[PDB]
Every structure is written in structure tokens, then in C-alpha cells.
Amino acid sequence: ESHPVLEKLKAAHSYNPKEFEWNLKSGRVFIIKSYSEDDIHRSIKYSIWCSTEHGNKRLDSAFRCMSSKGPVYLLFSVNGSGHFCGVAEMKSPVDYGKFDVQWIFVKDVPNNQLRHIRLENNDNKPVTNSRDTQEVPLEKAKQVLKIISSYKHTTSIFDDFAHYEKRQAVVEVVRKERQSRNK
Structure with a gap:
């Protein structure tokens, strides 16, 4: 049994494209650390993201600087997840x-597929030990993107899609009822 929201998304977008250009001619690449799976799920379904105030200012500046001259890519990981x-x-x-x-x-x-890549602009720490909106230098970013594109993954957040849908729905009713008790 597959969820109609997920089937619509998969039909409209070409997730995990088998031809992806990791050997970028130009562009800038940043780490996103999310607070929860729920935020990732919402971001995938609505094509939206929000960082902190400072993170938003950093990303805004980078996007405007790029002036349509190359892409700004975001590499997502939830705090504490290990992937x-x-x-x-x-x-x-x-x-x-x-x-x-x-x-x-x-x-x-x-993370064990990526921890050998270290960021010279962050005390040579592994790219897997980054904070939100840490920038990845272009050549290391190429190596990260090559690994992500190529990796024969066994799972993804889509495998729990129905779960996240039900979670969201229940949270909304609970909040509405709570407001109802407060008027």
C-alpha cells in the first residue's frame, strides 16, 4: 500500500536521477542540520525550507551572490541521525x-561513507561533523555529491511516508482542540 501524496510527488519529480552532474563547473554547497524527520517530510511535500535567523541570512546572501551563475545545493541531515x-x-x-x-x-x-572527507575551512573536521549552514569547498563538495549520487541506498524517509502523514494530521487536531479549550 502506497500513499497518494507520495505517488503524486514521485510522478511529478524525478527523484534520485541516474544522470546527475556531480563534477560541478560552478556552484556553492551547504550542510543543513534539521531538528527532526517531520521537518524533512514537510519540506519534501511542500518544496520549502526555513533555517534559523542567522542561517537564513547566510543562505540568502549566498543565493543572491550566485546570481543565476550556478546552483546552490543543500545536503540534509537530522541532528543525531548518523546519515x-x-x-x-x-x-x-x-x-x-x-x-x-x-x-x-x-x-x-x-556517515561512514562520507567521514573520510574533511573540510579545510572548518579545522579539517569530517564533513559529517558539521553545523547548520556550514559551507563545503567546491572540490570536497564534488566528492560528496559523487558518493551520494552513486550510493546504492537501502532505505529513505519515503519508507515511512504514511507514518509522517498520520503524525501531522493528529498534531493538527490536537492543537485545534487545545485552542478550543483556550477560548
């Missing part, structure tokens, strides 16, 4: 906060 869960392209500046994204890869890549 990356996907890759989206930033598609608009920040609107005050939120900005448009286009999800491209939706797949789990364990």
Missing part, C-alpha cells in the same frame, strides 16, 4: 521565513 537523507537545490531568496527548494536526492547515505 544524510537527501539533497535539494535552493530556488529562491528568503521571504520574510522561508525559501523555495527543489528536492533532488531522497535517500539514506550512512
Whole structure:
């Protein structure tokens, strides 16, 4: 049994494209650390993301600087998870906060596949030990994207899609009822 929201998304978008250009001619690449799976699920279904105030300012500045001269890619991981869960392209500046994204890869890549890549601009720490909106230098970003694109993943957040749908629905009714008790 597959969920109609997920079937619509898969039919409208070409997730995990088998031809993806990891050897970028230009572009900038950033880490996104999400607070929960629920935020990832919402972002995939609505093509939207929101960082902190400072994170939003950093990403806004990077997107405007790129001036349509190359892509801004975002590599997503939930705090404490032990894997990356996907890759989206930033598609608009920040609107005050939120900005448009286009999800491209939706797949789990364990950290042990990526920890050998270290970021010279962050004390040579592994890319898997990054904070939200940490920037990845272009050549290391190429190696990360090559690994993510190629990885033969066994699972992804889509495998729990119906679960996240039901969670969202129940949260809404609970909040509405709570407001109802407060008027």
C-alpha cells in the first residue's frame, strides 16, 4: 500500500536521477542540520525550507551572490541521525521565513561513507561533523555529491511516508482542540 501524496510527488519529480552532474563547473554547497524527520517530510511535500535567523541570512546572501551563475545545493541531515537523507537545490531568496527548494536526492547515505572527507575551512573536521549552514569547498563538495549520487541506498524517509502523514494530521487536531479549550 502506497500513499497518494507520495505517488503524486514521485510522478511529478524525478527523484534520485541516474544522470546527475556531480563534477560541478560552478556552484556553492551547504550542510543543513534539521531538528527532526517531520521537518524533512514537510519540506519534501511542500518544496520549502526555513533555517534559523542567522542561517537564513547566510543562505540568502549566498543565493543572491550566485546570481543565476550556478546552483546552490543543500545536503540534509537530522541532528543525531548518523546519515544524510537527501539533497535539494535552493530556488529562491528568503521571504520574510522561508525559501523555495527543489528536492533532488531522497535517500539514506550512512556517515561512514562520507567521514573520510574533511573540510579545510572548518579545522579539517569530517564533513559529517558539521553545523547548520556550514559551507563545503567546491572540490570536497564534488566528492560528496559523487558518493551520494552513486550510493546504492537501502532505505529513505519515503519508507515511512504514511507514518509522517498520520503524525501531522493528529498534531493538527490536537492543537485545534487545545485552542478550543483556550477560548
